Enzyme design. Structure first.
Site, short mmCIF file in Angstrom:
data_model
loop_
_atom_site.label_atom_id
_atom_site.label_comp_id
_atom_site.label_asym_id
_atom_site.label_seq_id
_atom_site.Cartn_x
_atom_site.Cartn_y
_atom_site.Cartn_z
N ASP A 119 0.32 79.47 28.97
CA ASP A 119 -0.07 80.25 27.70
C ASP A 119 -0.62 81.79 28.19
O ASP A 119 -1.65 82.26 27.55
CB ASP A 119 -1.00 79.60 26.78
N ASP A 137 -8.23 80.08 31.42
CA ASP A 137 -7.57 78.81 30.68
C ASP A 137 -6.49 78.35 31.35
O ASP A 137 -5.67 77.70 30.89
CB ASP A 137 -7.26 79.37 29.34
BR1 SCQ Z 1 -13.76 81.37 30.26
C1 SCQ Z 1 -14.05 83.12 29.99
C2 SCQ Z 1 -14.91 83.99 30.77
N1 SCQ Z 1 -15.02 85.21 30.04
N2 SCQ Z 1 -14.17 85.10 28.69
C3 SCQ Z 1 -13.77 86.25 28.14
N3 SCQ Z 1 -14.37 87.20 28.21
C4 SCQ Z 1 -13.98 88.52 27.48
C5 SCQ Z 1 -14.84 88.82 26.33
C6 SCQ Z 1 -14.45 88.84 24.93
N4 SCQ Z 1 -15.17 88.98 23.95
C7 SCQ Z 1 -16.59 89.27 24.42
N5 SCQ Z 1 -17.07 89.49 25.68
C8 SCQ Z 1 -16.25 89.00 26.63
C9 SCQ Z 1 -13.06 85.62 26.94
C10 SCQ Z 1 -12.23 84.55 26.95
C11 SCQ Z 1 -11.33 84.28 25.91
C12 SCQ Z 1 -11.78 84.18 24.41
C13 SCQ Z 1 -11.14 83.98 23.25
C14 SCQ Z 1 -9.78 83.80 23.54
C15 SCQ Z 1 -9.38 83.68 24.78
C16 SCQ Z 1 -10.13 83.95 25.91
C17 SCQ Z 1 -12.67 83.66 27.95
C18 SCQ Z 1 -13.66 83.95 28.77
#
Ligand code: SCQ
Length: 278
Positions: A119, A137
């Site tokens: 994905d 992920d």
């Molecule tokens: Br583990 C992980 C470690 N950092 N991170 C981030 N960081 C980017 C970020 C986004 N918004 C605010 N601060 C940082 C996003 C997601 C993610 C979240 C939702 C969907 C897919 C991936 C997963 C994830």
């Protein structure tokens, strides 16, 4: 869980809400995902050993109250936000090339361990100030966007392999270059048909066995293939050649991450620093 202080919601993953959080102990800032079947626990436990510089590190897995929390390394920005932010100017080719190269290194690693992402999408590609980009992920799979889905998945193939990730990354590569999603389908058939309209309706000639696939229909419209020069201008011939190989219909013909790394496109690869507004 009492060991973590929620700082903020950083999105809504496919499995649950993801939170930026602070370890009340170490003071470490992490990403906390709130997702149990023994198989799931065992599979996830395996992911903890899958360590690589271009893979978001899974720090710990916490199962309590039949609840499952995954603690990951925290990165400040994702590729989707960065692409949105760089939309007027576009991401410089050298940075696009660096990101593509790093992601291919990450894929090459996972794939060598027989671990698929399944994905890949801009939202799960995380970036830092150092010019690094990381896959998030990974291995978790084993409205949700269909834009990056490989055709063999759309055609009902039950046992697809690593090639599905190469397809997704080829789509993301095109999107970085053009500043527009390559195949933004809004249903499985619309996704399939968008792919056909651009790459041509697949047949036994270019994809032996495609006509026998579960969801294949002889009634599919027959569209002609378009030239990549029209698809991703003004990407140079090296970039277009690599792209064309990552987008081969036949999963067996699709370039592997390993081979892609040796492609002439990367002859002059470097590691630029992006400009990030955190
Ligand atoms: Br583990 C992980 C470690 N950092 N991170 C981030 N960081 C980017 C970020 C986004 N918004 C605010 N601060 C940082 C996003 C997601 C993610 C979240 C939702 C969907 C897919 C991936 C997963 C994830």
């Amino acid at each position: 869980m009492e060991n973590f202080q929620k700082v903020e919601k950083i999105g809504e993953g496919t499995y649950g809400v993801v939170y930026k959080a602070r370890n009340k102990l170490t003071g470490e800032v992490v990403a906390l995902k709130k997702i149990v079947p023994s198989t799931a626990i065992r599979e996830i436990s395996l992911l903890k050993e899958l360590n690589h510089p271009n893979i978001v590190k899974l720090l710990d897995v916490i199962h309590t109250e039949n609840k499952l929390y995954l603690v990951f390394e925290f990165l400040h920005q994702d590729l989707k936000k960065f692409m949105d932010a760089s939309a007027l100017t576009g991401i410089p080719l050298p940075l696009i090339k660096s990101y593509l190269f790093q992601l291919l290194q990450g894929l090459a690693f996972c794939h060598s361990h027989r671990v698929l992402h399944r994905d890949l999408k801009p939202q799960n590609l995380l970036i830092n100030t150092e010019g690094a980009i990381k896959l998030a992920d990974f291995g978790l799979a084993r409205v949700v966007t269909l834009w990056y889905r490989a055709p063999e998945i759309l055609l009902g193939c039950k046992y697809y392999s690593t090639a599905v990730d190469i397809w997704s990354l080829g789509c993301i590569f095109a999107e970085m270059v053009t500043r527009r999603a390559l195949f933004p389908g809004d249903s499985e058939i619309d996704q399939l048909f968008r792919i056909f309209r651009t790459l041509g309706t697949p047949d036994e000639v270019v994809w032996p066995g495609v006509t026998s696939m579960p969801d294949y229909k002889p009634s599919f419209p027959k569209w002609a293939r378009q030239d990549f020069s029209k698809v991703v201008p003004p990407l140079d011939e090296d970039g277009r050649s690599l792209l064309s190989q990552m987008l081969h219909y036949d999963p067996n013909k699709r370039i592997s991450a390993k081979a892609a790394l040796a492609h002439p496109f990367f002859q002059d690869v470097t590691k630029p620093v992006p400009h990030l507004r955190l």
